[PDB]
Amino acid sequence: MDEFEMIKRNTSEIISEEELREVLKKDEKSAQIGFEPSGKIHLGHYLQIKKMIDLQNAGFDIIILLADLHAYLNQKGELDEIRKIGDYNKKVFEAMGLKAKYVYGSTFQLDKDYTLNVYRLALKTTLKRARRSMELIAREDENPKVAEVIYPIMQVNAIHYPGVDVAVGGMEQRKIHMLARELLPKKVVCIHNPVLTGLDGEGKMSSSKGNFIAVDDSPEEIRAKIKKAYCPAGVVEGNPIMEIAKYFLEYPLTIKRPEKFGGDLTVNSYEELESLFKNKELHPMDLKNAVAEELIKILEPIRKRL
Amino acid sequence: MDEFEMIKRNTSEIISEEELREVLKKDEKSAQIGFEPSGKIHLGHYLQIKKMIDLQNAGFDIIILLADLHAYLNQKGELDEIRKIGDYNKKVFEAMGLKAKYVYGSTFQLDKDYTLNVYRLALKTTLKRARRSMELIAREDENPKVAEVIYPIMQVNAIHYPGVDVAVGGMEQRKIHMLARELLPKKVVCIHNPVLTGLDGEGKMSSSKGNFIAVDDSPEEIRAKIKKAYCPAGVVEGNPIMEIAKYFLEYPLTIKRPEKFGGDLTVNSYEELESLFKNKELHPMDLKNAVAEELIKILEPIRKRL
Ligand SMILES: [K+]
């Protein structure tokens, strides 16, 4: 209960909890998040779309900004082709239960007045504050190009443009997001989501790699990908399987196993589960077994309506 | 005649003379130079609106580009405001005897397509290669802004846009130009010009703060300005007066002179005068005089034509 808490839940931070308190009181409020069209939609996207839904059920008008432009320039399909990848992402998000408005930056991000403000913003954005923004995202070409410093003021003006009250994004975007706070006349509330550690235990669950779990993958694809997944003893920090637990599973969870090698349990909460894994009583295999079967029932409704 | 040698005249360099030649062969050849609307139009502009004329006389269809947008951005005027300023310059350049095509950057540099290529280009411009470009133009900025490194590519696509065969301009522009040459399908021929020094020897005569002889200056003002001008005997390098001698006076000119101070002289080459001034024969005073009077005769045609 408490719209505040529901939005707050599982977030990594809310730039000004105070400002959100106020936004909520408004009878008309908007929140926007951006997604570049992805071939496969993984738990990483789902984690966030899930958060968008939160704001959805709280009076917020959701806007899912589709970054097809970046794909255009960055040598990838043609816009028409991208539209097709992106309109699939819509079918998925709708599957997740996201009643939002979808836009393609490729319809406003080049228009006259937009470019103008962008340039305008460029006058008040230090080469440094900009670079450090993009620092969180990717590592930084051998020899960096001008486009890299432009990206952040592009994303900035994309928050300004709609005039929304809230911006959602993973923690990679806090720098850019903070630039927006300091540069736009309208300070926007930012809700950042934790990043999701890939299966092999490296970076994010980027589909630009192969350590992800698609919201559509078959019950087999899941069981497989999980049994391989990185998941040490006692260690919870960095543990992919443990995140999947903290952010997607419903409780009270009841994990099984022969009273010979353990004993069936019932972790009414996650902290509860975490503490076990820390105390060692819950072997990595039992966890995977539990998460797998569970994760499967959860992502089930989505695969279905697809 | 050899128009190549005509144009070659008073040019700090012609990036690819051979290419220039290949150009002169064509029937349809065009070139453009760029100017930011200015209140006072001093000899600075003159040195080049002249060269521009040489190329129009070789056949090159002239194109002037009043970068009213840059001017806008730098919190100067308000487009339509600036507009009238540039349109005044248009008149001054016309009162200088230049047939040409006049265009405002604000009318294209903000178009989807144009902006689109700026970004494509942004992926091809290293952060430094971009910075080292502006450095020759206007020093550096304590806390550089993305605007700085965006301008160069903003100028590159400015050569591309019309598809000019040659890009005229000052030497501060050399490094910007190379870029346009290294990043565009064709390799425009760049005829860079000397950079006229201010009457105090501190730099370029800048309409933007001080030292300069504005074309419409009255004989009397010209005399008062040329007199105060830094011009040390024997010193030719740096001396603005001498530059004015070199780039504007027709030879042979008869430097009027006190019978008892050496007596009237008649130089048939700038080299004589140089030789003279260097050897301390032509004292600065007699020099400043022969020059001021001579300028007043050349500018009058333009001055009164207004
Ligand atoms: K509360």
XYZ file of C-alpha atoms and ligand atoms in Angstrom:
613
model
C 0.000 0.000 0.000
C 0.988 3.708 -0.132
C 1.634 4.785 -3.757
C 4.832 6.353 -2.439
C 6.154 3.089 -1.052
C 4.995 1.140 -4.106
C 7.010 3.399 -6.416
C 9.868 3.479 -3.906
C 10.042 -0.309 -3.682
C 13.143 -1.904 -5.209
C 14.483 1.429 -6.466
C 18.098 2.414 -6.115
C 17.189 6.054 -5.429
C 14.602 8.768 -5.841
C 16.245 12.102 -6.578
C 14.382 14.086 -3.961
C 11.858 11.896 -2.200
C 10.371 15.230 -1.116
C 9.714 16.375 -4.661
C 8.034 13.034 -5.457
C 5.760 13.466 -2.443
C 4.588 16.694 -4.013
C 4.290 15.382 -7.553
C 2.033 12.611 -6.348
C -0.417 15.136 -4.898
C -0.924 16.546 -8.413
C -4.053 15.403 -10.279
C -2.149 15.427 -13.563
C 1.391 13.997 -13.686
C 3.711 12.374 -16.213
C 6.692 10.027 -16.074
C 9.002 9.077 -18.989
C 11.655 6.365 -19.484
C 13.686 5.613 -22.567
C 14.461 2.312 -24.299
C 16.439 1.830 -27.485
C 14.696 -0.971 -29.457
C 16.019 -4.345 -28.355
C 16.044 -7.632 -30.219
C 15.208 -9.485 -27.064
C 13.455 -8.048 -24.003
C 15.091 -9.389 -20.856
C 14.457 -9.213 -17.108
C 16.493 -6.036 -17.247
C 13.844 -4.267 -19.287
C 11.096 -6.040 -17.376
C 12.558 -4.855 -14.066
C 12.080 -1.269 -15.277
C 8.797 -1.658 -17.183
C 7.612 -3.152 -13.895
C 8.586 0.091 -12.202
C 6.816 2.113 -14.915
C 3.633 0.145 -14.182
C 4.026 1.180 -10.531
C 3.805 4.846 -11.516
C 1.063 3.816 -13.929
C -1.198 2.710 -11.112
C -0.612 5.987 -9.310
C -2.007 8.531 -11.715
C 1.152 9.007 -13.719
C 0.892 9.208 -17.467
C 3.548 6.854 -18.773
C 5.606 7.661 -21.875
C 7.969 5.036 -23.251
C 10.467 6.932 -25.420
C 11.899 4.690 -28.108
C 15.514 5.490 -29.048
C 15.341 4.510 -32.690
C 17.464 7.534 -33.677
C 20.548 6.281 -31.905
C 20.175 3.008 -33.829
C 19.848 5.011 -37.081
C 23.078 7.009 -36.769
C 25.029 4.381 -34.870
C 24.998 2.255 -37.989
C 22.113 -0.172 -37.602
C 18.868 -0.638 -39.456
C 16.939 2.058 -41.284
C 14.234 3.831 -39.251
C 11.442 1.827 -40.918
C 13.298 -1.344 -39.980
C 13.872 -0.088 -36.399
C 10.188 0.842 -36.062
C 9.527 -2.874 -36.551
C 11.898 -3.945 -33.753
C 10.450 -1.186 -31.586
C 6.825 -2.028 -32.258
C 7.545 -5.548 -31.045
C 8.903 -4.121 -27.823
C 5.492 -2.475 -27.542
C 3.637 -5.817 -27.858
C 5.908 -7.113 -25.090
C 5.476 -4.138 -22.766
C 1.748 -4.363 -23.342
C 2.114 -8.049 -22.447
C 3.738 -6.989 -19.186
C 0.737 -4.780 -18.520
C 2.182 -1.382 -19.443
C -0.512 1.012 -20.569
C 1.806 3.752 -21.763
C 2.198 6.097 -24.719
C 5.012 5.149 -27.097
C 7.091 7.623 -29.102
C 10.131 7.405 -31.403
C 12.713 10.103 -30.801
C 13.134 10.002 -34.568
C 10.062 12.187 -34.898
C 11.074 15.041 -32.675
C 14.801 14.676 -31.986
C 15.826 16.316 -35.259
C 13.096 18.956 -35.633
C 14.294 22.593 -35.775
C 13.476 23.953 -32.335
C 14.734 20.742 -30.707
C 18.224 20.885 -32.281
C 18.282 24.558 -31.328
C 17.715 23.941 -27.619
C 20.239 21.131 -27.801
C 22.896 23.491 -29.149
C 21.656 26.031 -26.567
C 22.297 23.456 -23.842
C 25.707 22.745 -25.290
C 26.813 26.309 -24.333
C 26.276 25.530 -20.661
C 27.623 21.989 -20.522
C 31.312 21.427 -19.726
C 33.231 18.947 -21.796
C 33.977 17.327 -18.434
C 30.568 17.086 -16.843
C 29.433 15.638 -20.163
C 32.177 13.036 -20.556
C 31.831 11.812 -16.986
C 28.130 11.303 -17.737
C 28.823 8.965 -20.597
C 31.466 7.387 -18.374
C 28.889 5.340 -16.491
C 27.457 4.013 -19.741
C 30.240 2.594 -21.934
C 34.006 2.455 -21.380
C 35.193 5.380 -23.882
C 36.463 4.844 -27.395
C 40.241 4.567 -27.679
C 40.042 8.098 -29.006
C 36.557 9.542 -28.144
C 34.437 11.455 -30.641
C 32.298 14.583 -30.361
C 29.117 12.529 -30.635
C 29.918 11.083 -27.214
C 29.608 14.493 -25.529
C 26.456 15.275 -27.544
C 24.589 12.157 -26.391
C 23.982 13.470 -22.829
C 22.508 16.816 -23.912
C 20.397 14.895 -26.424
C 18.983 12.715 -23.672
C 18.671 15.811 -21.515
C 16.575 17.809 -23.955
C 14.475 14.670 -24.348
C 13.307 15.085 -20.739
C 12.788 18.781 -21.167
C 10.784 18.341 -24.393
C 7.875 16.307 -22.974
C 7.787 18.333 -19.760
C 7.215 15.170 -17.724
C 7.524 15.248 -13.940
C 9.485 12.061 -13.530
C 12.338 10.332 -15.386
C 12.977 6.628 -14.938
C 16.223 4.833 -15.800
C 18.800 2.512 -14.354
C 21.652 3.863 -12.219
C 23.825 4.280 -15.336
C 21.827 7.404 -16.121
C 22.175 9.241 -12.821
C 24.878 11.527 -14.250
C 22.888 12.527 -17.307
C 19.788 12.717 -15.061
C 21.662 15.000 -12.689
C 22.701 17.203 -15.604
C 19.008 17.569 -16.447
C 18.311 18.573 -12.869
C 20.997 21.236 -13.045
C 20.275 22.474 -16.581
C 16.553 22.493 -17.274
C 14.331 25.257 -15.810
C 12.070 22.506 -14.548
C 13.798 20.229 -12.095
C 12.517 16.687 -12.615
C 12.170 13.875 -10.078
C 14.350 10.947 -11.007
C 13.627 7.381 -10.039
C 16.633 5.156 -10.781
C 16.449 1.367 -10.837
C 19.261 -0.907 -9.692
C 21.273 -2.449 -12.501
C 20.801 -6.149 -13.161
C 23.932 -8.315 -13.053
C 24.244 -10.675 -16.024
C 24.095 -14.467 -15.603
C 27.842 -15.073 -15.898
C 28.331 -12.444 -13.224
C 29.957 -9.617 -15.182
C 28.098 -6.529 -16.399
C 24.435 -5.782 -16.983
C 22.011 -8.269 -18.530
C 22.728 -6.697 -21.903
C 21.285 -8.708 -24.798
C 24.272 -7.276 -26.704
C 25.837 -10.292 -24.976
C 24.315 -13.660 -24.038
C 23.871 -13.627 -20.273
C 20.214 -12.665 -20.270
C 16.824 -14.239 -19.647
C 14.196 -13.153 -22.155
C 10.686 -12.545 -20.888
C 9.704 -14.966 -23.649
C 12.307 -17.746 -23.375
C 10.836 -21.242 -22.954
C 10.787 -23.028 -19.606
C 13.741 -24.943 -20.946
C 15.761 -21.917 -21.970
C 15.349 -20.648 -18.416
C 16.233 -23.852 -16.542
C 19.308 -24.128 -18.716
C 20.579 -20.543 -18.480
C 20.083 -20.596 -14.741
C 21.939 -23.851 -14.002
C 25.000 -22.385 -15.712
C 24.700 -18.946 -14.106
C 27.335 -17.632 -11.707
C 26.173 -18.115 -8.076
C 28.828 -18.663 -5.303
C 28.459 -20.059 -1.790
C 27.290 -17.648 0.895
C 28.110 -14.753 -1.411
C 25.071 -12.595 -2.259
C 26.830 -9.513 -3.563
C 26.919 -9.850 -7.336
C 24.866 -13.035 -7.257
C 22.651 -12.991 -10.400
C 20.311 -15.681 -9.090
C 19.916 -13.771 -5.788
C 18.951 -10.539 -7.614
C 16.376 -12.407 -9.660
C 14.988 -13.387 -6.247
C 14.996 -9.948 -4.677
C 13.381 -8.325 -7.735
C 10.935 -10.782 -9.316
C 9.878 -13.673 -7.074
C 6.741 -13.585 -4.935
C 6.735 -14.727 -1.338
C 6.325 -16.546 0.981
C 8.503 -18.866 -1.137
C 8.679 -22.551 -0.296
C 11.925 -24.230 -1.377
C 12.163 -28.039 -1.553
C 14.815 -30.719 -0.992
C 15.199 -34.237 0.481
C 15.318 -34.099 4.296
C 18.451 -36.079 3.680
C 20.289 -33.172 2.111
C 18.376 -30.391 3.846
C 14.636 -30.141 4.364
C 11.811 -28.319 2.627
C 11.431 -24.727 3.940
C 9.411 -21.513 3.512
C 11.263 -18.184 3.408
C 8.438 -15.717 4.085
C 10.688 -12.906 2.857
C 13.801 -12.202 0.837
C 15.965 -11.015 3.740
C 15.025 -14.401 5.149
C 16.286 -16.123 1.993
C 19.328 -13.901 1.851
C 20.270 -14.757 5.422
C 20.089 -18.460 4.573
C 22.368 -18.109 1.590
C 24.717 -16.167 3.896
C 24.519 -18.811 6.619
C 25.234 -21.406 3.904
C 22.272 -23.673 4.702
C 20.926 -22.944 1.219
C 23.247 -24.529 -1.370
C 23.505 -22.739 -4.750
C 21.800 -25.619 -6.580
C 18.670 -25.552 -4.354
C 18.363 -21.811 -4.977
C 18.579 -22.137 -8.768
C 16.067 -25.001 -8.661
C 13.744 -22.750 -6.656
C 14.280 -19.552 -8.632
C 14.108 -21.370 -11.981
C 10.753 -23.076 -11.405
C 9.460 -19.873 -9.810
C 10.860 -17.366 -12.325
C 9.072 -19.619 -14.838
C 5.623 -19.331 -13.337
C 6.110 -15.569 -13.108
C 7.231 -14.801 -16.685
C 4.639 -17.359 -17.819
C 1.649 -14.994 -18.294
C 3.823 -12.853 -20.567
C 5.113 -15.637 -22.833
C 1.527 -16.871 -23.091
C -0.080 -13.725 -24.508
C 2.718 -13.555 -27.082
C 46.623 37.078 -66.722
C 46.653 33.518 -65.484
C 43.690 33.846 -63.127
C 45.421 31.223 -60.983
C 48.224 33.662 -60.263
C 45.729 36.504 -59.811
C 43.895 34.538 -57.121
C 47.166 33.126 -55.811
C 47.926 36.780 -54.915
C 47.989 37.716 -51.210
C 46.967 34.276 -50.033
C 48.708 32.765 -47.013
C 48.205 29.418 -48.822
C 45.970 27.432 -51.187
C 45.448 23.902 -49.914
C 46.046 22.043 -53.162
C 46.985 24.617 -55.819
C 46.936 21.776 -58.369
C 43.315 21.157 -57.376
C 42.603 24.898 -57.719
C 43.893 24.677 -61.263
C 41.762 21.626 -62.046
C 38.873 23.801 -60.861
C 39.516 26.918 -62.968
C 39.139 24.541 -65.939
C 35.493 23.967 -65.145
C 32.767 26.237 -66.484
C 30.610 25.920 -63.402
C 32.678 26.643 -60.296
C 31.490 28.127 -56.990
C 32.986 29.115 -53.657
C 31.768 30.569 -50.376
C 33.227 32.362 -47.421
C 31.484 32.876 -44.116
C 30.860 36.016 -42.089
C 29.149 36.709 -38.751
C 26.990 39.849 -39.018
C 29.062 42.797 -37.913
C 28.230 46.339 -36.880
C 31.402 47.992 -38.085
C 32.849 46.382 -41.245
C 36.606 47.088 -41.095
C 39.462 46.391 -43.523
C 39.520 42.937 -41.988
C 36.488 41.981 -44.019
C 37.835 44.004 -46.935
C 41.022 41.909 -47.308
C 38.746 38.972 -48.133
C 35.656 40.418 -49.762
C 38.377 41.466 -52.173
C 39.777 37.967 -52.715
C 36.142 36.887 -53.063
C 35.868 39.272 -55.995
C 38.998 37.817 -57.649
C 37.284 34.432 -57.692
C 34.064 35.918 -59.064
C 36.179 37.431 -61.806
C 37.674 34.000 -62.527
C 34.098 32.817 -62.912
C 33.415 31.355 -59.462
C 29.815 32.112 -58.473
C 30.176 33.738 -55.088
C 28.288 32.677 -51.987
C 28.405 34.604 -48.735
C 27.083 32.937 -45.606
C 25.968 35.226 -42.783
C 26.089 32.861 -39.790
C 23.241 34.615 -38.009
C 22.536 31.497 -35.980
C 25.904 31.346 -34.287
C 25.417 35.036 -33.526
C 21.991 34.228 -32.093
C 23.229 31.468 -29.860
C 25.940 33.665 -28.330
C 23.154 35.657 -26.712
C 23.789 38.535 -29.080
C 20.758 39.470 -31.168
C 17.350 37.960 -31.909
C 17.481 36.496 -35.413
C 15.198 39.066 -37.087
C 17.199 41.654 -35.148
C 20.566 40.352 -36.289
C 19.002 39.917 -39.716
C 18.967 43.658 -40.319
C 22.598 43.876 -39.217
C 23.719 41.270 -41.717
C 21.584 42.843 -44.420
C 23.524 46.075 -43.762
C 26.772 44.160 -44.252
C 25.218 42.771 -47.421
C 25.115 46.431 -48.537
C 28.703 47.165 -47.507
C 29.945 44.101 -49.393
C 27.905 45.337 -52.346
C 29.404 48.825 -51.962
C 32.726 46.995 -52.303
C 31.875 45.720 -55.764
C 30.937 42.106 -55.151
C 28.307 40.296 -57.149
C 27.213 37.358 -55.020
C 24.649 35.092 -53.413
C 23.803 35.899 -49.778
C 22.423 33.348 -47.290
C 21.577 33.050 -43.600
C 22.674 29.949 -41.725
C 19.495 30.071 -39.682
C 17.631 29.041 -42.798
C 19.234 25.626 -43.227
C 21.627 24.693 -40.441
C 18.632 23.690 -38.344
C 16.936 21.425 -40.870
C 16.464 17.748 -40.030
C 18.725 16.547 -42.836
C 21.455 19.090 -42.081
C 21.339 18.419 -38.332
C 21.297 14.715 -39.111
C 24.611 14.888 -40.905
C 26.137 17.032 -38.164
C 25.504 14.033 -35.921
C 26.766 11.475 -38.478
C 29.840 13.698 -38.669
C 29.965 13.835 -34.856
C 30.688 10.115 -34.924
C 33.647 10.846 -37.177
C 35.215 13.705 -35.250
C 37.618 12.937 -32.439
C 37.157 15.154 -29.390
C 40.644 16.613 -29.783
C 40.825 16.939 -33.548
C 37.703 19.034 -32.950
C 39.182 21.087 -30.126
C 42.529 21.785 -31.817
C 40.353 23.320 -34.564
C 38.793 26.090 -32.536
C 42.060 26.822 -30.768
C 43.434 28.814 -33.691
C 40.160 30.723 -33.887
C 39.473 32.135 -30.418
C 41.951 30.951 -27.761
C 40.387 28.448 -25.339
C 37.706 28.356 -22.621
C 38.520 27.930 -18.914
C 35.842 25.223 -18.765
C 35.328 24.101 -22.391
C 31.750 23.378 -23.426
C 30.419 20.810 -25.886
C 29.488 23.800 -28.017
C 33.171 24.349 -28.692
C 33.766 20.935 -30.228
C 30.400 21.033 -32.010
C 31.069 24.258 -33.900
C 33.851 22.762 -36.074
C 31.608 20.003 -37.379
C 28.916 22.718 -37.638
C 31.214 24.509 -40.065
C 32.293 21.353 -41.913
C 28.729 20.553 -42.959
C 28.481 24.247 -43.841
C 30.967 23.701 -46.661
C 29.240 20.466 -47.624
C 25.708 21.912 -47.756
C 25.996 24.014 -50.913
C 28.668 21.827 -52.524
C 31.191 24.577 -53.188
C 34.332 23.840 -55.186
C 36.363 26.183 -52.968
C 36.147 27.390 -49.369
C 37.692 30.862 -48.852
C 38.716 32.138 -45.425
C 41.246 33.311 -42.882
C 44.131 31.215 -41.554
C 42.506 30.734 -38.173
C 40.283 28.465 -40.250
C 42.977 26.144 -41.617
C 42.487 23.305 -39.105
C 38.699 23.519 -39.373
C 39.075 23.191 -43.115
C 41.383 20.197 -43.064
C 38.658 18.411 -41.158
C 36.057 19.310 -43.787
C 38.573 17.947 -46.242
C 39.246 14.726 -44.250
C 35.532 14.099 -43.580
C 33.595 14.975 -46.727
C 33.260 12.956 -49.941
C 35.035 15.712 -51.902
C 38.136 17.743 -50.995
C 37.220 21.425 -51.323
C 40.108 23.680 -52.218
C 40.743 26.018 -49.340
C 42.250 29.404 -50.058
C 43.270 30.727 -46.677
C 43.960 34.446 -46.220
C 46.424 36.475 -44.180
C 45.094 37.656 -40.831
C 45.190 41.479 -40.759
C 46.633 42.867 -37.500
C 44.975 45.457 -35.272
C 46.220 49.017 -35.112
C 47.850 48.283 -31.750
C 49.705 45.184 -32.867
C 47.782 43.125 -30.343
C 45.996 40.888 -32.847
C 43.346 40.865 -35.553
C 41.663 44.195 -36.007
C 38.519 43.251 -34.131
C 35.340 45.190 -34.761
C 34.602 43.372 -31.523
C 36.516 45.777 -29.257
C 38.779 48.474 -30.669
C 41.555 48.709 -33.233
C 40.362 48.962 -36.833
C 39.626 51.170 -39.818
C 35.987 50.689 -40.687
C 35.344 51.183 -44.414
C 32.873 54.012 -43.827
C 35.298 55.849 -41.539
C 35.719 59.514 -42.477
C 39.085 60.640 -43.883
C 39.638 62.524 -40.692
C 38.905 59.498 -38.486
C 41.138 57.365 -40.697
C 43.967 59.856 -40.231
C 43.497 59.894 -36.457
C 43.362 56.109 -36.330
C 46.348 55.465 -38.633
C 48.435 57.951 -36.623
C 47.894 56.303 -33.249
C 48.573 52.919 -34.845
C 51.509 50.889 -33.586
C 54.222 51.191 -36.209
C 57.854 50.923 -34.965
C 60.655 51.963 -37.324
C 62.639 49.193 -38.944
C 60.052 46.727 -37.651
C 58.001 45.247 -40.483
C 56.858 41.963 -38.983
C 53.672 42.554 -36.992
C 53.372 46.191 -38.047
C 49.697 46.656 -39.080
C 50.461 49.739 -41.103
C 52.872 47.836 -43.333
C 50.242 45.088 -43.805
C 47.809 47.737 -44.862
C 50.503 48.897 -47.305
C 51.038 45.398 -48.681
C 47.411 44.342 -48.999
C 45.730 47.527 -50.175
C 47.908 50.250 -51.708
C 48.486 50.346 -55.439
C 52.086 50.743 -56.467
C 53.951 52.768 -57.448
C 52.853 55.150 -54.719
C 54.661 58.428 -54.102
C 55.272 58.772 -50.388
C 55.180 62.539 -49.939
C 58.186 63.552 -47.824
C 59.913 66.541 -46.149
C 62.585 67.889 -48.486
C 64.906 68.007 -45.483
C 63.839 64.604 -44.174
C 65.069 62.660 -47.175
C 62.783 64.172 -49.780
C 59.881 62.604 -51.672
C 60.170 58.945 -52.681
C 58.544 56.754 -55.311
C 58.275 53.030 -54.528
C 57.433 50.622 -57.361
C 57.105 47.613 -55.053
C 55.943 46.847 -51.567
C 59.451 45.367 -51.239
C 61.011 48.802 -51.811
C 58.946 50.331 -49.003
C 59.666 47.274 -46.868
C 63.379 47.538 -47.706
C 63.139 51.229 -46.991
C 61.160 51.024 -43.765
C 63.478 48.222 -42.646
C 66.640 50.212 -43.314
C 65.101 53.054 -41.284
C 65.025 55.415 -44.255
C 61.269 55.636 -44.353
C 60.526 56.768 -40.807
C 57.134 55.642 -39.429
C 55.612 59.135 -39.721
C 56.123 59.570 -43.462
C 54.954 55.976 -43.766
C 51.754 56.444 -41.770
C 50.982 59.514 -43.875
C 51.420 58.058 -47.324
C 49.246 55.174 -46.123
C 46.411 57.111 -44.466
C 45.959 59.415 -47.435
C 46.091 56.427 -49.754
C 43.459 54.512 -47.767
C 41.150 57.537 -47.760
C 41.284 57.564 -51.527
C 40.439 53.888 -51.861
C 37.652 53.695 -49.311
C 35.909 56.914 -50.339
C 34.271 55.152 -53.315
C 32.640 52.654 -50.922
C 32.090 55.160 -48.105
C 30.100 57.693 -50.122
C 28.425 54.917 -52.118
C 26.529 54.390 -48.871
K 4.799 6.270 4.046
